[PDB]
């Protein structure tokens, strides 16, 4: 199928209690493979998947060098933006950066991403065409001129369409055993009487990969988003994912309701019903 | 691999 590589950067200022906290993580699909923490002892880019340890000392030196460099630029950026918004030195402020590429089944470029936020809100983001920027507010408009003058769009596109794609290809190959696997969900259904005239059906999906899954409820065939509860797809901790969906149902009519579980690893869409 | 073209905001 299609695949993605994503890098996530978080810088948080601690005015008075030392230099800003910087954390970088690398992802291929829903699997993490690299990590950097500015507060960790090692002061290195560390591996968080087995298949990235195939890379030699040149990779780890360069990635360590470049992630340290990012944190240095963010440290200046935290000062610059503090100015733009006329904020005090006392306040703790966050910069977040997400960038990465998507490839089709053939491993060729599909889409590129690079979005930036200040205090958990849009600041600047690269458009789909990867030639122009969208600034969210007045402050970001100043960043937009600097990045236009520096031809940052062209260099980001060159990365997203080149180095990003061909490194994603390398990782998918080295990690084929895990990254191109599709584990089907272990599905079951639990019943909890709410009162004497109501009962909650809960449809379970356990130990599936990747994270993409759809859990819908049907009553006599027709779809049900009314009296429906849905939790965020959560990590098991072993590299698999968990999810459930529940419906408040009248007592006696449990058999009328049916859960529908759509997932790649499943040959056909499963159809579960209470025992 | 990390993108290393670092332009100040």
């Amino acid at each position: 199928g299609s695949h993605s590589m994503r890098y996530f950067y978080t810088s948080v200022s601690r005015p008075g209690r030392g230099e800003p906290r910087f954390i970088a993580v690398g992802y291929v699909d829903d699997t993490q493979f690299v990590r950097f923490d500015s507060d960790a002892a090692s002061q290195r880019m560390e591996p968080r998947a087995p298949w990235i340890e195939q890379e030699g000392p040149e990779y780890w030196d360069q990635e360590t060098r470049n992630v340290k460099a990012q944190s240095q630029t963010d440290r200046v950026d935290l000062g610059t933006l503090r100015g733009y918004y006329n904020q005090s030195e006392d306040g703790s402020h966050t910069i977040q950066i997400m960038y990465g590429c998507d490839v089709g089944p053939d491993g060729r470029f599909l889409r590129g991403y690079r979005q930036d936020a200040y205090d958990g809100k849009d600041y600047i983001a690269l458009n789909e065409d990867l030639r122009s920027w969208t600034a969210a507010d007045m402050a970001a408009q100043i960043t937009k001129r600097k990045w236009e003058a520096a031809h940052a769009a062209e260099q980001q596109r060159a990365y997203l369409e080149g180095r990003c794609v061909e490194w994603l290809r390398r990782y998918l190959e080295n990690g084929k055993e895990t990254l191109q696997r599709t584990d089907p969900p272990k599905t079951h259904m639990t019943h909890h009487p709410i009162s004497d005239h109501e009962a909650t059906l809960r449809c379970w999906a356990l130990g599936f990969y990747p994270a993409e899954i759809t859990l819908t409820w049907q009553r006599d065939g027709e779809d049900q988003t009314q009296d429906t509860e849905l939790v965020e797809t959560r990590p098991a901790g072993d590299g698999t994912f968990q999810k459930w969906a529940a419906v408040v149902v009248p007592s006696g009519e449990e058999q009328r309701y049916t859960c529908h579980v759509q997932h790649e690893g499943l040959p056909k869409p499963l159809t579960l019903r209470w025992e | 691999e990390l993108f290393s073209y670092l332009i100040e905001k």
Partner: T-cell receptor, first 112, second 113 residues
Framework: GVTQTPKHLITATGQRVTLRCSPRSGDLSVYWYQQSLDQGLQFLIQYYNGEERAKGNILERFSAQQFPDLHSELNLSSLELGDSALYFC????????????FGPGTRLTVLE | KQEVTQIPAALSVPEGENLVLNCSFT??????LQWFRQDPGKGLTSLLLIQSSQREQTSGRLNASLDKSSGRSTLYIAASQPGDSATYLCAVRQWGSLGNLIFGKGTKLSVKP
């Protein structure tokens, strides 16, 4: 607007010298380059906002530093005849991917 | 592995003539290629910066072309003058590196008055 001191320096083998570099006002980046007839222009080391950012082929006996005021000092220890060269520092307003403005350079001669 | 070469290393042209200065790089993975001027025993002055997306950059009598994959960049000097007489230095910045320059040995231009 980059200044380097001293402008010329004659020195004996085995001794230690310090080359000073003041970047342009408001510039965050300082790069150090060595120019010899032998090797041409070669990247030694670069600093960003008081911190080391990247190393080149700097020898163990060469160390450098960027101070809080953003000025830089390059220290050359156990000097050999071969170290005779022009040592340029270049400052940059950002990281130095677009612009690198060079100082007039410190000409080091190492004699026996 | 990135080797920047400028051949010929010495060019001698009559005054007023169009001249061609050559640059080569073995690895096409570059952010940009920057042409520099050096008067003897003095600092470098930036002539033209060519971004990897651009095929052409012009400024006065200086014109510079780039093809990354070919590993080629040419610097043209129209109506050459004695004042142009200097060493012309070619440099590139590597993908995955933080902006440091990798220089050629330079071409010493002598515009004969």
């Amino acid at each position: 607007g980059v200044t380097q001191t001293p402008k010329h320096l004659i020195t004996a083998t085995g001794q230690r010298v310090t080359l000073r570099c003041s970047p342009r006002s408001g510039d965050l980046s300082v790069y150090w380059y060595q120019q010899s007839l032998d090797q041409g222009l070669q990247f030694l080391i670069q600093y960003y906002n008081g911190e080391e950012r990247a190393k080149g082929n700097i020898l163990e006996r060469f160390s450098a530093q960027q101070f809080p005021d953003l000025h830089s000092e390059l220290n050359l220890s156990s000097l050999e005849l071969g170290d005779s060269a022009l040592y340029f520092c270049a400052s940059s307003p950002g990281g130095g991917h677009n612009e690198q403005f060079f100082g007039p350079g410190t000409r080091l001669t190492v004699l026996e | 592995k990135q080797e920047v070469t400028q051949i010929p290393a010495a060019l001698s042209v009559p005054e007023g003539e169009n001249l061609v200065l050559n640059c080569s790089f073995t690895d096409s993975a570059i952010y940009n290629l920057q042409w520099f001027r050096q008067d003897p025993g003095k600092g470098l002055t930036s002539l033209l910066l060519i971004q990897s997306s651009q095929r052409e950059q012009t400024s006065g009598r200086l014109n510079a072309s780039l093809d990354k994959s070919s590993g080629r960049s040419t610097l043209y000097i129209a109506a050459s003058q004695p004042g142009d007489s200097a060493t012309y230095l070619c440099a590139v910045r590597q993908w995955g590196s933080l902006g440091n320059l990798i220089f050629g040995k330079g071409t010493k231009l002598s515009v004969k008055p």
